[PDB]
């Protein structure tokens, strides 16, 4: 359910995805990208 889980990453990651200059550990895409990868997979978990 990457919708509420969208919140999971999407919040963290869309919060991240949506600065790596060095603030990436604070960005949250780290997941976004890999884990938003799988939070975005959280629903794209076919």
UniProtKB/Swiss-Prot annotation:
One Gene Ontology term of the molecular function aspect: proton-transporting ATP synthase activity, rotational mechanism
Name of a matching Pfam family: ATP-synt_C
Subcellular location: Cell inner membrane
Keywords of this entry: ATP synthesis, Cell inner membrane, Cell membrane, CF(0), Formylation, Hydrogen ion transport, Ion transport, Lipid-binding, Membrane, Transmembrane, Transmembrane helix, Transport
Chain ranges on the Periplasmic side, renumbered to this chain: 41-46
InterPro entries found in the cross-reference section: ATP_synth_csu_bac/chlpt, ATP_synth_F0_csu, ATP_synth_F0_csu_DDCD_BS, ATP_synth_F0_csu_sf, ATPase_proteolipid_c-like_dom, F/V-ATP_Csub_sf
Known role: F(1)F(0) ATP synthase produces ATP from ADP in the presence of a proton or sodium gradient. F-type ATPases consist of two structural domains, F(1) containing the extramembraneous catalytic core and F(0) containing the membrane proton channel, linked together by a central stalk and a peripheral stalk. During catalysis, ATP synthesis in the catalytic domain of F(1) is coupled via a rotary mechanism of the central stalk subunits to proton translocation. Key component of the F(0) channel; it plays a direct role in translocation across the membrane. A homomeric c-ring of 10 subunits forms the central stalk rotor element with the F(1) delta and epsilon subunits.
Protein's name in the database: ATP synthase subunit c
Naturally occurring in which organism (per UniProt): Escherichia coli (strain K12)
Organism taxonomic ancestry: Bacteria, Pseudomonadati, Pseudomonadota, Gammaproteobacteria, Enterobacterales
């Amino acid at each position: 359910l990457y919708m509420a889980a969208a919140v999971m990453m999407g919040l963290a990651a869309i919060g991240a995805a949506i600065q790596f200059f060095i603030v990436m550990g604070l960005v949250d895409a780290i997941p976004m990208i890999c884990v938003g990868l799988g939070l975005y997979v959280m629903f794209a978990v076919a």
